Amino acid sequence: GSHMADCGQMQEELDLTISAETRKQTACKPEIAYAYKVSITSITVENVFVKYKATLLDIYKTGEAVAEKDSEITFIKKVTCTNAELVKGRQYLIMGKEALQIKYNASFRYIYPLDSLTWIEYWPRDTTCSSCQAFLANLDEFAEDIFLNGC
């Protein structure tokens, strides 16, 4: 019963190659409905299906799935994911299509499906701890870029 899947494919933590435009030419992309940075604050784990309670930090691209400055998002997926692992306390960037909607009364809502399309990139919470500080130089440019400039 050994299964393998890229699930919510992730990216490198620190690698000099991704410029500020790399997170834009794909941000304004139709396949992408939203482009904001959030942070993990709570994680849920069940028998097989698990969820992730995280707060939105800032939105660079409005989300079709009810996206607002500092909201309440929850990512759900199967434990069969052997390529994605979120940490409680760290920050992660997300740029992708909206989430499925089922909200009818309370037993339903949005709960992101968490797939490989969901462009996720670990954002080093610290800048002076790894003695590196290099990939965080191009990210700062995109911050005021999409906000001001924008596609």
Curated annotation (Swiss-Prot):
From the record, what ranges are coiled-coil? none
Query: Where does the UniProt entry place glycosylation sites?
Result: N105
What activity regulation does UniProt give? Membrane attack complex (MAC) assembly is inhibited by CD59, thereby protecting self-cells from damage during complement activation. MAC assembly is also inhibited by clusterin (CLU) chaperones that inhibit polymerization of C9.
This protein's source sits in the domain of life called Eukaryota
Task: Tell me where it resides.
Answer: Secreted; Target cell membrane
**Which residues form each disulfide bond in the chain?**
C7-C81, C28-C151, C129-C132
Q: Which residues form the NTR domain?
A: 7-151
Listed under subunit, the entry gives:
Complement C5b is composed of complement C5b and complement C5 beta chains that are associated via disulfide bonds. Component of the membrane attack complex (MAC), composed of complement C5b, C6, C7, C8A, C8B, C8G and multiple copies of the pore-forming subunit C9. Interacts with the tick complement inhibitors OmCI, RaCI1 and CirpT1. Interacts with cobra venom factor (CVF).
Q: What does this protein do?
A: Component of the membrane attack complex (MAC), a multiprotein complex activated by the complement cascade, which inserts into a target cell membrane and forms a pore, leading to target cell membrane rupture and cell lysis. Complement C5b is generated following cleavage by C5 convertase and initiates formation of the MAC complex: C5b binds sequentially C6, C7, C8 and multiple copies of the pore-forming subunit C9.
Q: What is this protein called?
A: Complement C5b
Q: Which organism is it from?
A: Homo sapiens
Tell me the part of the parent protein that is shown: 1530 to 1676 of 1676
